[PDB]
Every structure is written in structure tokens, then in C-alpha cells.
């Protein structure tokens, strides 16, 4: 039932530009996904109108809800008997992602509404987790949420720090982006009691998540920044590390190096066009591109341990569709 997974082999049959999200990724777990939605409405809305609206509005903003869909896919790939528990776990994953977005939307509705809605969602997610009655799952989630918060704080500490290393960037993005993908996929394996699939699914999702954040960062130094709901140079303004900037420093000397460095330290608008030009022409973006492809390769390799099912194929198709953004 199991077999090797190769990016080059996928490309032989199936160009990534051909991959459709509804038919090639969602379709296997479609009914399950639709059943997840019914559970969420019960999960949040009837008591407080302000939350279901915001959580609806937030969900309305931006991307397809891949995180819960991945959870549902790993559960089927694990032959989970009680998929209702997968649907509940998918909802937890989604409420947690939504909480994080609403909380990242707070700036220095409104901030108080956003803070309170995020807290409410964290509370319901954790109450739903407790209802699943699995202490292994609870401990994974509790340690994991600490790692997510630690990642987010590490990023805040690394703001306007030109000396930030690639090691540190990978540490940050694993915390702030990758760990939630791991909870989604490995938590599915934990639910199914498929302990042999836990580490493969974790490694898959972590590498997936790593490539996902590298591409996001790349896109903020290109004309497709709007796709992320951002303007070009936004990350620069905030002084967040980002691999394009770290790599730009690695691919620059003399005055160009000094400009990028000062720009990170100060975060002034004056040299912003110059900095974007250096990042684009230094080769830094190509370096980030290669790193994202390498992570995508590591993701698919970890997946190849699982049996060849439509559910595995869907996860593979998602990884390639994500990579195709660049």
C-alpha cells in the first residue's frame, strides 16, 4: 500500500499550475469539512454574536482554510474510525488559527473586540480539546501552544535586529507557523492511535509550514504582496527578520550591506525602495526560493512513509500547490 514520493515524479504527470484546490485537495475530505462547519457554529456563535461575526469576517478575509483540511486529510490517511473526533479536532485547529489572526490584527471593530474575541476562541478550543478526553493530545497541544507563543515572542525580541541569524529565523517560524500544522496532522495520528505515523506526519507538516512561511516572506518583496493582504516593504517597516532580508545581508557587501543593516535597525521609509531593489537583485529571493523547495522536498519525503491513498495524494498536491505560489 505504501510507496516513494518524489517531486520530480509528480511533475512528470502533473504540472503544479494544473492543481485545483477544490478538486485535488479538499474533495477527499469534503463531506467531513462540511460537517466540521456545523460543529463550529455550535462551537461558538449562538451565545455571543460578536464572535461568530468576527470569526466569520476574519475567515472571510484571506486564504482557504488549509489547516483544518490538512487535519481531516491526515485523519483519513490514518484510517481514523471516529471521524467526528477528526472534525472536532479540525475545528480546534481552526479556532486557534483564527484566534492568532485576530490577535495579530491588534495595533499600537477594534483592539478590545479583537483581544476578547481571540481569548474566547482560545477558551472554546481548549474546552473542545478537553472533551476529546485524550491526555496525550492535550499535552501535545499544551506544549505546542507554548511553543507558538514562544515563537511569537522571539520574533518580537528579534525586531530591528540586523544580527539575527538564519538559525534564529527558522526557530521563529517553526514556532509561529509550523507548530500549528504539526498539531493538526500529528494530532490526527494521536486520535487514530497510529503512533508510527506521528513522527512522519509531524515532520511533514513542519517542513510544509517552514516552506509556507518562507514563501509568504518572499511575496512581501514582490508585486504579489497584495495576495497576502499586504503592501510591498511592510515587513521591513515593522523590522521583522524575514529570510529575504537576512539572505540579502549574506548576499551583499560594502554600502549595499550597510543600507540593509541600517534599514532593519531604524525602519525608516527613506531607503525602502533601495532596500527592496537590493533584495530583488542580490539573489536573496532566489536563495529563499531554493530553501522553500528544499523544505517542500523534506515534507514529501516524510509523507512517503504513509500508505498511498487519495488522502496522501491530497496532502502531496497541497504541498506542491503551496510551493507554486512562487
Residue 45 interacts with Cl ion (CB under 5 A)?
Answer: no
For a second copy, the binding residue among 124, 174, 207, 240 (CB under 8 A) is: 124
Q: What are all long-range contacts of 217-224, with beta carbons under 8 Å and residues at least 24 apart?
A: 217/242, 217/243, 217/244, 217/288, 218/243, 218/244, 218/285, 218/288, 218/289, 218/292, 218/326, 219/325, 219/326, 220/244, 221/276, 221/279, 221/280, 221/285, 222/280, 222/285, 224/325
Q: Which does 103 bind (CB under 5 to 8 A by kind): a second copy, Cl ion, none?
A: a second copy
Binding mask 149-178 for Cl ion (x = CB under 5 A): ------------------------------
Residue 16 interacts with Cl ion (CB under 5 A)?
Answer: yes
For a second copy, the binding residue among 8, 12, 46, 108 (CB under 8 A) is: 108
107/136 Cα distance (integer angstroms) = 36
Residue 143 interacts with a second copy (CB under 8 A)?
Answer: yes
Q: Judged by CB, which is closer to Cl ion: 66, or 299? A: 66
For a second copy, the binding residue among 126, 267, 289, 304 (CB under 8 A) is: 126
Instruction: Single out the segment in contact with a second copy by CB under 8 A; choices: 48-56, 57-65, 81-89, 286-294.
Output: 48-56
25/16 Cα distance (integer angstroms) = 12
Please report where in the chains the cell 475545528 appears, as a residue.
91
Q: Judged by CB, which is closer to Cl ion: 134, or 252? A: 134
Distance of CA 55 to the CA centre of its chain: 18
Sign of CA dihedral 118, 120, 124, 129: positive
Q: Judged by CB, which is closer to a second copy: 96, or 211? A: 96
Residue 255 interacts with a second copy (CB under 8 A)?
Answer: no
30/27 Cα distance (integer angstroms) = 5
Residue 69 interacts with Cl ion (CB under 5 A)?
Answer: no
Q: Which residues pair with 2 in a beta bridge?
A: 307
Spatial neighbors of 74 by CB under 8 A, at least 6 apart, are 184, 185, 186, 188, 189, 201, 311, 315
Residue 96 interacts with a second copy (CB under 8 A)?
Answer: no
Residue 51 interacts with a second copy (CB under 8 A)?
Answer: yes
Distance of CA 38 to the CA centre of its chain: 24
Instruction: Single out the segment in contact with Cl ion by CB under 5 A; choices: 12-20, 218-226, 243-251, 297-305.
Output: 12-20
Residue 320 interacts with Cl ion (CB under 5 A)?
Answer: yes
DSSP state of 63: S
For a second copy, the binding residue among 27, 149, 250, 259 (CB under 8 A) is: 149
Extract the C-alpha cell encoding 121.
476562541
For a second copy, the binding residue among 139, 274, 290, 324 (CB under 8 A) is: 139
For a second copy, the binding residue among 154, 172, 285, 288 (CB under 8 A) is: 154
Instruction: Single out the segment in contact with a second copy by CB under 8 A; choices: 9-17, 26-34, 109-117, 279-287.
Output: 109-117
Breaks in the chain (C to N over 2.5 Å), named by the residue before each, are 108
CB of 184 to Cl ion, least distance (A): 9
Amino acid at each position: 500500500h505504501s510507496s516513494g514520493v518524489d517531486l520530480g515524479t509528480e511533475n512528470l504527470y502533473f504540472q503544479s499550475m494544473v492543481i485545483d484546490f477544490k478538486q485535488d485537495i479538499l474533495a477527499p475530505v469534503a463531506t467531513d469539512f462540511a460537517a466540521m462547519d456545523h460543529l463550529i457554529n455550535e462551537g461558538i456563535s449562538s451565545k455571543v454574536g460578536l464572535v461568530m461575526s468576527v470569526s466569520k469576517h476574519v475567515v472571510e478575509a484571506g486564504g482557504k482554510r488549509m489547516r483544518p483540511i490538512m487535519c481531516l486529510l491526515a485523519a483519513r490517511a490514518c484510517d481514523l474510525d471516529n471521524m467526528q473526533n477528526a472534525q472536532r479536532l479540525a475545528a480546534i485547529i481552526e479556532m486557534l488559527h483564527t484566534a492568532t489572526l485576530v490577535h495579530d490584527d491588534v495595533v499600537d471593530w477594534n483592539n478590545q473586540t479583537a483581544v476578547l474575541v481571540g481569548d474566547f476562541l482560545i477558551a472554546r478550543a481548549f474546552d473542545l480539546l478537553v472533551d476529546l478526553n485524550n491526555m496525550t493530545l492535550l499535552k501535545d497541544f499544551s506544549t505546542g501552544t507554548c511553543e507558538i507563543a514562544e515563537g511569537e515572542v522571539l520574533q518580537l525580541q528579534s525586531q530591528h535586529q540586523p544580527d539575527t541569524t538564519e538559525e534564529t529565523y527558522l526557530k521563529i517560524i517553526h514556532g509561529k507557523t509550523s507548530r500549528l500544522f504539526e498539531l493538526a496532522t500529528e494530532g490526527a495520528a494521536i486520535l487514530a492511535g497510529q503512533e508510527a505515523y506521528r513522527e512522519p506526519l509531524r515532520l511533514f507538516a513542519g517542513h510544509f509550514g517552514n516552506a509556507f512561511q518562507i514563501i509568504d516572506d518572499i511575496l512581501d518583496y514582490t508585486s504579489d504582496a497584495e495576495t497576502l493582504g499586504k503592501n510591498i516593504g511592510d515587513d521591513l517597516m515593522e523590522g521583522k527578520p524575514t529570510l529575504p532580508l537576512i539572505s540579502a545581508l549574506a548576499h551583499s557587501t560594502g554600502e549595499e550591506h550597510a543600507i540593509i543593516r541600517r534599514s532593519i535597525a531604524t525602519g525608516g521609509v527613506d531607503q525602502l525602495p533601495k532596500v527592496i531593489e537590493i533584495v530583488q537583485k542580490s539573489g536573496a529571493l532566489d536563495y529563499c526560493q531554493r530553501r522553500a523547495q528544499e523544505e517542500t522536498e523534506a515534507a514529501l519525503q516524510a509523507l512517503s512513509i504513509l500508505p498511498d491513498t487519495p488522502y496522501r495524494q491530497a496532502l502531496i498536491n497541497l504541498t506542491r500547490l503551496a510551493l507554486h505560489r512562487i
